[PDB]
Write a protein that holds these residues in place. Structure first.
Motif, PDB file in Angstrom:
ATOM      1  N   UNK A   6      21.648 -27.564  29.818  1.00  0.00           N
ATOM      2  CA  UNK A   6      22.092 -27.540  31.112  1.00  0.00           C
ATOM      3  C   UNK A   6      21.767 -29.523  31.185  1.00  0.00           C
ATOM      4  N   UNK A   7      21.224 -30.285  30.655  1.00  0.00           N
ATOM      5  CA  UNK A   7      20.967 -31.297  31.167  1.00  0.00           C
ATOM      6  C   UNK A   7      23.031 -32.468  30.925  1.00  0.00           C
ATOM      7  N   UNK A   8      23.028 -31.719  29.966  1.00  0.00           N
ATOM      8  CA  UNK A   8      24.378 -32.722  29.647  1.00  0.00           C
ATOM      9  C   UNK A   8      25.731 -31.589  30.457  1.00  0.00           C
ATOM     10  N   UNK A   9      25.557 -30.441  31.118  1.00  0.00           N
ATOM     11  CA  UNK A   9      26.773 -29.376  31.700  1.00  0.00           C
ATOM     12  C   UNK A   9      26.195 -30.321  32.838  1.00  0.00           C
ATOM     13  N   UNK A  10      24.762 -30.387  33.552  1.00  0.00           N
ATOM     14  CA  UNK A  10      25.580 -31.054  35.342  1.00  0.00           C
ATOM     15  C   UNK A  10      25.514 -32.084  35.077  1.00  0.00           C
ATOM     16  N   UNK A  11      25.329 -33.552  34.161  1.00  0.00           N
ATOM     17  CA  UNK A  11      25.739 -34.271  33.943  1.00  0.00           C
ATOM     18  C   UNK A  11      27.684 -34.514  34.160  1.00  0.00           C
ATOM     19  N   UNK A  17      27.669 -17.286  26.444  1.00  0.00           N
ATOM     20  CA  UNK A  17      27.739 -17.131  27.203  1.00  0.00           C
ATOM     21  C   UNK A  17      27.310 -18.061  28.665  1.00  0.00           C
ATOM     22  N   UNK A  18      27.536 -17.048  29.982  1.00  0.00           N
ATOM     23  CA  UNK A  18      27.805 -17.984  31.283  1.00  0.00           C
ATOM     24  C   UNK A  18      26.389 -17.741  31.598  1.00  0.00           C
ATOM     25  N   UNK A  42      29.569 -21.973  32.982  1.00  0.00           N
ATOM     26  CA  UNK A  42      29.528 -22.521  31.676  1.00  0.00           C
ATOM     27  C   UNK A  42      29.905 -23.169  30.537  1.00  0.00           C
ATOM     28  N   UNK A  43      30.637 -21.820  30.220  1.00  0.00           N
ATOM     29  CA  UNK A  43      32.111 -20.839  29.324  1.00  0.00           C
ATOM     30  C   UNK A  43      33.365 -22.475  29.694  1.00  0.00           C
TER      31      UNK A  43
END
Ligand SMILES: CC(C)C[C@H](N)C(=O)NS(=O)(=O)OC[C@H]1O[C@@H](n2cnc3cc(CO)cc(N)c32)[C@H](O)[C@@H]1O
Ligand SMILES: [Mg+2]
Ligand SMILES: [Zn+2]
Length: 843
Positions: free
Chosen positions: A554-559, A430-431, A195-196
């Motif tokens: 997490x939601x914004x990451x997966x999008x 962090x990852x 995610x970083x």
């Protein structure tokens, strides 16, 4: 029309009417403007909590309001089904986590349907079905091939008596929660989301979210924790190089966000894992015990600032590259290995933590920043000590008089010519570790083969099905004990190989379900291309504040992951965000013979003080707090529905408090909701019992009496207020009071004449529509008594601007009742002591 309000007689029928018309089962109809309104879907824990009803009522008000305004509204619902509660329930009751889950789902589904939420049940999902989680296994394999998912060893807490892994939140004083045994730190291979790599994307795109609480945005910015700082190298003194190797014999490298204070460093601090700490502890047992105690700790970052900061001097020294000062190295418990260089410098004069640390140990503090003519006191911290905006350097040689940024650049230049430092950007983030040593979760689609390595399962073979025929025992997670599951063949070479036995962090399911609702039976991908293009993003999201950081990030990451794969076209999943408060209730207790307290549920108590409903032995009334099993104070919403009907429940949650506020459980509150619904019923009934329905008043209101004009003014004023409260402010208690005020004025208006009844019809037809999003069963029923058209196709009440026009009130003139004396004197002169409403004084 029955005289008395009886919700059990009316709520089933209204629900059947809405279901039969399929008003909430929506398709991708391009001939109507979409509205996607989403509430955070629940864990199938067993039964509804009062917090569930509050959340989903709010969602339903907003959904029904948009529907009444002609939108194609999707309001989907489903079940966040994986996780620990099913496993705990399985260990306690000797049932399969899957069985206990599906039963809870079907029970809670009935409860949701009984409350009359305008839900598209055709779009239902349950994340523990393979038809769902195969798609996160799919995304996993693709990100694994691109390296966005990777596999490195990590450290975990191992409870050797319970034989499973425990998060830091489940360790108290170094021991497991349900065991009391000392946990052991172990390094095991785990999978991570890189995610970083998306940190700057996830941070900057927050600026787009003009319709999010700035509290949520700020908590995400702090969590990502980007800083623009400076890598600084302090050369190790010649007398301190014993036991060190490589670059660790040459210098200690640190990162700092305040290089403008480098001249103010009075010591440096190092982490327990740092080679300098290792070398200093070689012959000092006090440092060994401090290093061990630091490694023993298991402190989650929600509490690592609450931690008392401790340190020990090492007797090793480093040299400050800007002034040549020798600085002792300390091992400190707040310096974390894995963040930056695992070593920091300390400026006690301009960092509050450094100030308190230096104060405990009598370490030196050197002021190098000044702010105006403020006094500097080396023994009391002051807020201005840490100001970067309005400060100039002092006691810093050639850097004096410089502000923050110019000093920053001057220090970078000095350090870079010397080769001693350079600017650097860092992130606290962090990852994201996703491996879980648990059964009831989505299998990780990796096979281990000693020839081929860690190999992803081919897309043709997905899903890796979790076997539902399992009962967790409590001596390790079952998947590691199940050769039938993990013994397999390598999909690359065909030889003997073993499946990964760890399952995925259950946050993963809830990171993309909002996309899955758009096409939940799509068999070829995570989400259909047609449906993603139509529905776009969620317009309105509603859930608890406890998900402001992890779940939303997490939601914004997966999008952005899904967008980068070409599956979706939006950058951000959630346009508007509404966070609902807690639900609280009073607590009761009787004392223990063993000097404690036993907590009684409110439903098993009756208040005169108060006493039991069983033994009649009095209970003690105690504090109000969040409904939970801890102090046994949760109030079952099912019994509130049983005793009063759904419309009462819904009304009470919306009236008691605004969504952001804590909602206090109140028996007198619930009774007030029911009585107002009874008043609403009687009002319409009495109106019909006198003359029966008529055509609602509309059009030019000239010739109406002042009284009836005043009622129409109150009516369309109320309509505008309620619309502004539903659409903009999202405060629903104020909308309810507005409709109550409308009914008050109706109650004092004589509406017995012919134009009177036409206006009364207008009043009642609007009020029932204004209240339909909060209480649709009674409003649907009363509307049918007033008007034969379909409520949802009569639509939201329109404001009549004419009804807001107020009237006309040596020379006289005429001016509106909204004008003022600045033009009342400018119209009269065509000192003037204006007489507002009678005359004007031309002196
Ligand atoms: C999107 C994912 C991550 C949601 C996740 N499955 C979940 O939290 N699932 S859940 O089942 O825990 O809650 C679902 C939703 O309802 C709310 N909620 C539920 N019980 C509650 C009790 C109280 C007590 O004062 C207060 C609130 N706010 C309560 C909760 O905030 C969330 O928005
Ligand atoms: Mg915009
Ligand atoms: Zn192989």
């Amino acid at each position: 029309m029955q005289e008395h309000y009886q919700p059990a007689a009316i709520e089933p029928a209204a629900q059947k009417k809405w279901d039969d018309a399929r008003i909430s089962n929506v398709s991708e109809d391009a001939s109507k403007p979409k509205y996607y309104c989403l509430s955070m879907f629940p864990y199938p824990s067993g039964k509804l909590h009062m917090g569930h009803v509050r959340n989903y009522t709010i969602g339903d008000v907003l959904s029904r309001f948009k529907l009444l305004n002609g939108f194609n509204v999707m309001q989907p619902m489903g079940w966040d089904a994986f996780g620990m509660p099913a496993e705990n329930a399985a260990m306690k009751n000797n049932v399969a986590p899957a069985a206990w889950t599906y039963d809870n789902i079907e029970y809670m589904k009935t409860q949701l349907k009984s409350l009359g939420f305008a839900v598209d049940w055709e779009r239902e999902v349950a994340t523990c079905k393979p038809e769902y989680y195969r798609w996160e296994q799919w995304l996993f394999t693709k990100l694994f091939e691109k390296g966005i998912v990777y596999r490195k060893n990590g450290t975990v807490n191992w409870d050797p008596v319970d034989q499973t892994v425990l998060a830091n939140e489940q360790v108290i004083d170094g021991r497991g929660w349900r065991s009391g045994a000392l946990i052991e730190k172990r390094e095991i291979p785990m999978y991570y989301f890189k995610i970083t790599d998306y940190a700057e994307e996830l941070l900057n795109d927050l600026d787009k979210l003009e319709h999010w609480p700035e509290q949520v945005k700020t908590m995400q910015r702090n969590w990502i924790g980007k800083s623009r700082g400076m890598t600084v190298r302090f050369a190790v003194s010649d007398d301190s190089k014993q036991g060190l190797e490589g670059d660790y014999a040459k210098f200690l490298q640190v990162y700092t966000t305040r290089p403008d204070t480098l001249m103010g460093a009075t010591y440096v601090a190092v982490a327990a894992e740092h080679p300098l700490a290792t070398a200093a502890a070689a012959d000092k047992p006090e440092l060994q015990a401090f290093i061990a105690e630091c490694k023993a700790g298991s402190v989650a970052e929600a509490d690592m600032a609450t931690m008392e900061k401790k340190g020990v001097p090492t007797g090793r020294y480093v040299v400050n590259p800007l002034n040549g000062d020798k600085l002792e190295v300390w091992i400190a418990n707040y310096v974390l290995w894995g963040y930056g260089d695992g070593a920091v410098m300390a400026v006690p004069a301009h960092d509050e933590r450094d100030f308190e640390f230096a104060a405990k140990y009598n370490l030196p503090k050197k002021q190098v920043i000044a702010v105006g003519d403020n006094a500097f006191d080396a023994n009391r911290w002051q807020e201005w000590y840490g100001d970067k905006e309005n400060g100039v350097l002092v006691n810093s040689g050639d850097l004096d008089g410089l502000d923050f940024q110019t000093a920053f650049d001057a220090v970078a230049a000095k350090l870079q010519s010397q080769g001693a430092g350079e600017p650097k950007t860092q992130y606290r983030l962090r990852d994201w570790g996703i491996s879980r040593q648990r059964y009831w979760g989505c299998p990780i689609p990796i096979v281990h083969c000693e020839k081929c390595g860690n190999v992803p399962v081919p897309a043709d073979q997905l899903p890796v099905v979790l076997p539902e025929n399992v009962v967790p025992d409590g001596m390790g997670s079952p998947l590691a004990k199940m050769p039938e599951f993990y013994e397999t063949s390598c999909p690359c070479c065909g030889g003997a190989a073993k499946r990964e036995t760890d399952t995925m962090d259950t946050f993963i399911e809830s990171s993309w379900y909002f996309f899955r609702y758009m096409s939940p039976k799509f068999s070829d991908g995570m989400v259909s291309a047609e449906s993603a293009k139509y529905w776009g993003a969620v317009d309105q999201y509603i859930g608890g504040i406890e998900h402001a950081i992890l779940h939303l990030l997490y939601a914004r990451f997966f999008t952005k992951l899904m967008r980068d794969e070409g599956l979706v076209n939006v950058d951000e999943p959630f346009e508007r965000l509404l966070t609902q408060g807690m639900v609280v209730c009073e607590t009761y207790y009787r004392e223990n013979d063993k000097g404690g307290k036993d907590w009684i549920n409110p439903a098993d108590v009756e208040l005169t003080s108060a006493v039991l409903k069983a033994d009649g032995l009095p209970v003690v009334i105690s504090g109000t707090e969040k409904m939970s099993k801890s102090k046994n104070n949760g109030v079952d919403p099912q019994e509130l529905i049983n005793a009063y009907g759904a419309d009462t429940a819904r009304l009470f949650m919306m009236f008691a408090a605004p969504p952001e506020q804590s909602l206090e459980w109140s028996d007198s509150g619930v009774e007030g909701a029911h009585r107002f619904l009874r008043r609403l019923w009687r009002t319409v009934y009495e109106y019909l019992k006198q003359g029966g329905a008529v055509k609602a008043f509309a059009g030019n209101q000239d010739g109406l009496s002042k009284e009836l004009k005043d009622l129409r003014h109150k009516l369309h004023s109320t309509t505008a207020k309620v619309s502004d409260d539903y659409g903009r402010r999202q405060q629903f208690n104020t909308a309810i009071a507005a409709v109550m005020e409308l009914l008050n004025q109706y109650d004092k208006t004589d509406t017995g004449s012919e134009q009177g009844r036409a206006v009364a019809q207008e009043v009642l037809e609007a009020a029932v529509r204004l209240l339909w999003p909060i209480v649709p069963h009674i409003c649907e029923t009363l509307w049918s008594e007033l008007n034969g058209a379909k409520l949802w196709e009569a639509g939201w009440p329109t404001v009549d601007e004419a009804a807001l026009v107020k009237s006309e009130i040596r020379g006289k003139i005429t001016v509106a009742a909204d004008a003022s004396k600045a033009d009342l004197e400018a119209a009269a002169l065509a000192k003037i002591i204006v007489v507002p409403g009678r005359l004007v004084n031309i002196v």
